[PDB]
Amino acid sequence: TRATKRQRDQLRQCFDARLTDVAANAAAQAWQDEYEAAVEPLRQAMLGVLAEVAAVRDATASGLSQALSNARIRFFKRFAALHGNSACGLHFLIQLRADMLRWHKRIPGLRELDEDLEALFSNWFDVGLLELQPITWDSPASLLEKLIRYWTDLRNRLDSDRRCYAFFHPRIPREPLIFVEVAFVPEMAANVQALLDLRRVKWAIFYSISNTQAGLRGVSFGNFLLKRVIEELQREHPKLKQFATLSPIPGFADWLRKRDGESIDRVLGVKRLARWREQHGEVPADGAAWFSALSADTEDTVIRDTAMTLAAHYLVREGGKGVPADPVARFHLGNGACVERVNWGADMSRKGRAQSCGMMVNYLYVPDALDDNLARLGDGNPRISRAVAKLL
Amino acid sequence: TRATKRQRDQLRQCFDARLTDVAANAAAQAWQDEYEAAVEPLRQAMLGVLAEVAAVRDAATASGLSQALSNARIRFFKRFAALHNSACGLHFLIQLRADMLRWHKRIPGLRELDEDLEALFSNWFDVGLLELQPITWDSPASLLEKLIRYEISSWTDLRNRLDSDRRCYAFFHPRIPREPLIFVEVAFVPEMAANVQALLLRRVKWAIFYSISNTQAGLRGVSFGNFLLKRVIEELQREHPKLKQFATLSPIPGFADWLRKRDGESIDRVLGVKRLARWREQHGEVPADGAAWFSALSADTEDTVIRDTAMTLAAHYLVREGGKGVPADPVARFHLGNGACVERVNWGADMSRKGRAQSCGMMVNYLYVPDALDDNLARLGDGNPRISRAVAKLL
Ligand SMILES: [Mg+2]
């Protein structure tokens, strides 16, 4: 407890003093510097002090929880207001959450600080407050090297028949927050290997949307994220009317192998179960066995249909009400999209086959429907196309 | 595919050929070298090939496929554990699982390989097959530096822990010397310890285990058996036939995370009407839920009502929470799964920053009674953990 008492005092001001208090802000400015210029273990230790200070007050039970919540929030608000080596107070806060996130298992007691900040980060970095910028092969190398971490590959993705953007917070230029990759093709894509590999093109397809900030993992950017990109695409090409994605279904395999036989029988239905026995005999004993049976032949029509029905069910009817179990389905469904179609042999990479038997999905975005769909999702009734309803 | 087809062929033999097949073993020997001498991304890629091969069968019913796939993965590991860079085939397998474990999120499709190997590792490294060795300040520095990695960075900490009034051991697999598998730290004191900060020969009567750690990343999650501490006590009794008192001063790491996930209703049921009444009388409002309970129980380390309330919640957590015969707490599961008895809950036992954050600074003593370890191990399978009077009273 040498200088660790100076940091405690500093943090007490940042947590307890009013936002305007010039002294407390000075203290915050001080703590930041000392944190940015510190070895990895020193920071992990400073985080231990922070979770120490955040857990107590320097008096009902309901009033304690509230006072503790209000101080943690006050602590972050003060830092987000300081306009060092990072872009500003808001930026620092992003790196700080990066550490809290990777060291959670080492430094206990940050769960509440992490949850609060994540929630603040959802208001501060809401898409409505972010600026959209086009990214090309002409962009600064120092910027382009932030999208690789989260070069000829970049090139093709950044080519004439391609369009890429990045959302930035106005006061943190240089630091891309979200990276959107778009491809132009004649038909709504059904195989990802084609894309990653302007005359008469009619389809705009989003084949990649990634969060490029570790400190922002888990933060919600709003439901108008792609809506905003489409507006930019229409301004750029008023002739573009067809918008869809060719997304993965990452949590399909892990979900399937957790289901027993009974649940899958209920999903498939009597007719599908019968078509399976007729072609393959024995019905897999459970989900795990189902995954192994559905990966054994990418050519079989019964396997294809069975897998596609299981996939449509997974992304449309699995989740805690209005919240698709699949993260990818949650994002796109949570942006006003419609689950338009399931694609077999869409991603035959090693990873694709391991995540969903190489199955991908197309989420269709219809400008003048995004609102209606966003509503229907809250009712726990995801917007679906005829082809997908037929698989169910 | 320039060479990724050579590894696929190699792996096919290792998975499909008989264990004796000289060619397949050669192939395995080859794949190992190529893996040990490869950049991080190259290995992550080779792991992608492995999960590719493990998911399919070369050139059958559905139940027969799952079995054939299980039998090949098992055959793949058995072949490697039989060979003699790393100490041997078995050792390599340990590092291989180290990568599978840290890259699971990056390289999908290893879940089955990981599960199978973890299960094999439980038979191969069962305590009954491991040799016990004393560790002192005289041990090779190259060995001592494997226990620091897995406890201040100052070797002076190792020193005190490796001193006259202390006794430390390490379990090694006979064919992998140099590589400690488990590290046990023991302290000798006059009274069953109630405060960890203290531990860190003339008239000492208590032998207490204040630390037991797995020193191999590739072995995380593997079960070493229920005779782990039993074996160490035998060594302690051989060494000091006068020692009859054995206990631990363990942490309760998952207490806080469990508590904040409980609603008010569940805690009311745990505490009981009388305790809830004693709480209102002294502190007024009852915390709305578990999260609020944790914040209220951390606000005053001096209050007697807070202490008792927290201790009851703690005893409940480790004795009555878990999927039948399997204590929710990992630390409670290990020690309960070794024949121990939850002997007592200690308030203000670990007042470190971490201690207060994990369990409000509360620690627990698991008592080991040689001629009872079996009986307790049985009672735990019935979902009725062995408990002392003091802990039953908290419940
Ligand atoms: Mg209540």
Author numbering:
A (entry chain A): 58 to 115, 122 to 146, 150 to 216, 225 to 271, 279 to 473
B (entry chain B): 58 to 116, 122 to 146, 151 to 216, 221 to 270, 279 to 473
The authors write:
Malonyl-coenzyme A decarboxylase (MCD) is found from bacteria to humans, has important roles in regulating fatty acid metabolism and food intake, and is an attractive target for drug discovery. The MCD monomer contains an N-terminal helical domain involved in oligomerization and a C-terminal catalytic domain. Unexpectedly, the MCD catalytic domain is structurally homologous to those of the GCN5-related N-acetyltransferase superfamily, especially the curacin A polyketide synthase catalytic module, with a conserved His-Ser/Thr dyad important for catalysis. The catalytic domain of MCD contains a central eight-stranded, mostly antiparallel β sheet (β1–β8) that is surrounded by at least 11 α helices (α1–α11).
